[PDB]
């Protein structure tokens, strides 16, 4: 399963108790619409916790769009240990059944929020 | 020591052969792609080259000369030609290309 | 000391963390007691995966998707096989007819039945159970 | 002219083309294989895979078939095909067809 | 440039002053003769020193022959530091101009003769 | 301190050891003073490779094969170029017409002129000369 790559820089807030999921952009995304492109938008979801749901701005016909949306991981740093965040990129062809071109996730407990977690996250077409 | 690197030509046939194999074994017989199996290749790892994720039937008929509804290894392999062609060719008539 | 049997696959820190809910993922942690199952050979070659003292019993969804929580349906019966690659293999006899043998996604979860044949290496699990040596 | 960003499988088709490109830019013209570019390629990069470095001329004639003797940007490519099947297909092609 | 691989175990003699180049065999040797096989024989040569020349037994039509020939590196251990040994595998088709399917070499000075130098040497097709 | 200019290419301990004979190889040693050349920009962009205080002057054999000993023929004139990859590039203007720029084989020797294009990375040499900083 492959969804390309997504660059991001995640930082933590100890005042309001939220992690700042600042992604840069996604590169090399699968096509859905007829034309070799899609309307991929990242829908930030969470495990059982489910205490957060944000919809990014639809990116009409683009497999390498940039925007850098601000996702607020509503959950105390102390709680993050038991919360696995999941970033799924949803399409918005606007005709057929919008499919999940791909997604990515990481065990927050293993994400030592020392300062800022910046890295070139790999994207996978996990049909979940 | 072990895990010795071969020639670039052995590398590249392997990488596509393993990918092929990770689709060939989906259903009955881990050599032949059946119809779904075949469509799964294009729809997943081929969104630009052959952006036609609807007329897979046309490709299938163009490929499976005997129309057994099995692209055997060598029959399936045809696609890789049309790929290796397209990357140069793509629409060298109108577009353009790039 | 037959106890918490840890099992995972694919090179890289990732363990099968089972949850009563059913959504088991490859959590790369050993701090919280949720990555242990009671793996044992029930019948001649038939091994079962039941996270008794930690989670729930497994119950594959037609092999295609791997899950567990409600009841340890026959879907959870797998044939214990070993590969000369330092990995364990378990054939879901319940679906062996289709040459399908339990396969999980290290960075996704256990659910690759349509891809549980010879193609995905994730089928070669690496067990770290407390044997009686 | 050439390639900005590609994909995972596009790399591994590039790497072999890059071999092609640094062998065909020899006498004339990098866009066509010439016959002290071709023979040098078989004798160096394909001495084990292609166990017929002394009978290249036959392959050349079979490849070229417009017979302009520019092994063109897909005449040539066929060769990589013949090696690709060869690993599977020891000798067992025959065929004869106008 | 590829010629396959050659396994060898080289030891040193401090009584007669010679290095024992005990090779095991060569694997994946390129073809030369019409068909798919060659008559590769390793011709042990040396740099300027040129104080040694041995011809191995011709191996008729074989790309993975075994024999384990004994090459005596005629040169004092103390001198080895300034002598780069070169092992070239020569073909013996017996018809055309015998070509050098490949060869390999290593800076002896960097070869700390502590006990025995055993390794899986990589073979390259030296067009020389 | 313009002195012994060490130059080599391809990741891995290997230095260009020049010998009066001419057969220069990529010796991975720094004990014997035979891996230093007097690299300098003779003309505007034209750099020369002469192992004065250690070996001999270079004289490429039609670019195809790199050698040196007898005389520093024009073949030894190269254009100094730099690549954004922490490596130095030298274009053998003498054969630039054919798009050929000096290339050596870390585990073979300097002689890859018919393959000196955008394929063999060995063209990107890594210099370790004693500059005047």
Coil vs helix vs strand at D41: helix
Show the tokens assigned to D9: 């499988």
Three-state DSSP at B40 gives helix
Domains identified in chain F, total number: 1
C-beta of residue A69 within 8 angstroms of C-beta of residue A6: no
Residue B97: is the preceding peptide bond cis (ω within 30°)? Answer: yes
Tell me the pairing of strands F46-48 and F77-83: antiparallel
Please state, in angstroms and rounded to a whole number, the distance separating the CA atoms of residues F15 and F9.
Answer: 8
| Residue (of B13, B18, B22) closest to D89 by Cα position | B13
Instruction: Identify the chains in contact with E, defined as 3+ C-beta pairs within 8 A.
Output: B, D, F
**Tokens coding A111:** 């994400």
- Nearest alpha carbon to residue C101 among C128, C84, C70, C77: C77
**Mutating which of C106, C107, C110, C114 best tests the A interface, going by the most A Cβ atoms within 10 A?**
C107
**E-strand stretches of chain E:** 4-13, 18-27, 41-46, 54-55, 70-74, 85-90, 100-106, 116-123
Q: What does residue C27 show for φ and ψ, rounded to 5 degrees?
A: -70, 130
Q: Which residue of B has its CA nearest to D83?
A: B9
Residue D24's Cβ-count burial label (10 Å; 0-12, 13-18, 19+) is buried
Residue in chain A lying closest to C32 (CA): A82
- C52-58, long-range: CB < 8 A, 24+ apart: C53/C3, C53/C4, C54/C4, C54/C18, C55/C18, C55/C19, C55/C20, C55/C24, C56/C18, C56/C19, C56/C20, C56/C22
Residue C3 to residue C16: CA distance in whole angstroms: 15
Enumerate residues 6+ apart whose C-beta is below 8 A from D83: B9, B13, D46, D49, D50
Judging contacts by C-beta atoms under 8 Å, the chain A residues touching residue D5 are 27-28
Number of Cβ within 10 Å of residue A4's Cβ equals: 21
For residues C37 and C16, is the Cβ–Cβ distance under 8 A? Answer: yes
d(Cα A50, Cα C54) in Å, to the nearest integer?
A: 22
Q: Which residue of A has its CA nearest to C120?
A: A1
| Residues D43 and D53: beta-carbon distance below 8 Å | yes
Distance CA F61, CA E128 (A): 14
Q: What technique solved it?
A: NMR
Residues E110, E114, E115, E119: is their CA dihedral positive or negative?
negative
**Pairing of β A54-55 and β A70-74:** unpaired
Q: Do F27 and E48 touch (CB under 8 A)?
A: no
Peptide bond into B98 cis (omega under 30): yes
Burial of D61 from C-beta contacts in 10 A (0-12 / 13-18 / 19+): exposed
CB A42 within 8 A of CB A24: no
C117 with B23: Cβ contact below 8 A:
no
Whether the CB of E110 is below 8 Å from some CB of chain F: the reply is yes
Which among F37, D52, F18 is positioned nearest to E34, based on CA atoms? D52
Contact, C128 vs C4, CB < 8 A?
Answer: no
For the record, the structure tokens of D97 come out as 């067809």
- Chain F residues inside the 8 Å CB shell of E48: 19, 21, 23
Chain B contact residues (CB < 8 Å to A): 44-45, 47-48, 51, 53-54
The structural domains of chain D, ordered by start, are 1-98 (1.10.238.10)
For chain E, which domains are there? 1-128 (2.60.40.150)
Strand locations in C45-106 (E): 46-48, 77-83, 87-91
Boundaries of domain holding F86: 1-133
- Count Cβ–Cβ pairs < 8 Å, chain D vs chain E: 25
């Amino acid at each position: 399963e492959k969804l390309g790559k997504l660059q991001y820089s995640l930082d933590y807030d100890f005042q309001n108790n939220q992690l700042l999921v600042g992604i840069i952009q996604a590169a090399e995304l699968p096509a859905l619409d007829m034309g070799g492109t899609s309307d991929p938008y990242v829908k930030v979801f969470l495990l059982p916790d489910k205490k957060k749901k944000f919809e990014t701005k639809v990116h009409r016909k683009t497999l390498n769009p940039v925007f850098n949306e601000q996702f607020t991981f509503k959950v105390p740093y102390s709680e993050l240990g038991g919360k696995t965040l999941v970033m799924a990129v949803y399409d918005f062809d606007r005709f057929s059944k919008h499919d999940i071109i791909g997604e990515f996730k990481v065990p927050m407990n293993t994400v030592d929020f020392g300062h800022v977690t910046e890295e070139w996250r790999d994207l996978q077409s996990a049909e979940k | 020591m072990a895990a010795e690197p071969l020639t670039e030509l052995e590398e590249s046939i392997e990488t596509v052969v393993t990918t092929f194999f990770t689709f060939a074994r989906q259903e009955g017989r881990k050599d032949s792609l059946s119809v779904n199996e075949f469509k799964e290749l294009v729809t997943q790892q081929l969104p630009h080259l052959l952006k036609d994720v609807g007329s897979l039937d046309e490709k299938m008929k163009s490929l499976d000369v005997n129309q057994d509804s099995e692209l055997k290894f060598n029959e399936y392999w045809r696609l890789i030609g049309e790929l290796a062609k397209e990357i140069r060719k793509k629409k060298d008539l109108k577009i353009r290309x790039x | 000391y037959k106890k918490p049997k840890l099992l995972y696959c694919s090179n890289g820190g990732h363990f099968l963390r089972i949850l009563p809910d059913g959504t088991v993922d490859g959590t790369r942690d050993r701090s919280d007691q949720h990555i242990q199952l009671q793996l044992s050979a029930e019948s001649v070659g038939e091994v079962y995966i039941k996270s008794t003292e930690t989670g729930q019993y497994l119950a594959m969804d037609t092999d295609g998707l791997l899950y567990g929580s409600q009841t340890p349906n026959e879907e959870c019966l797998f044939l214990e096989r070993l590969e000369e690659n330092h990995y364990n293999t378990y054939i879901s006899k319940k679906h062996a007819e289709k040459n399908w043998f339990v396969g999980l996604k290290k960075n996704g979860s256990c659910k690759r039945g349509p891809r549980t044949h010879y193609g995905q290496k994730a089928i070669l699990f690496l067990p770290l159970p407390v044997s009686s040596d």
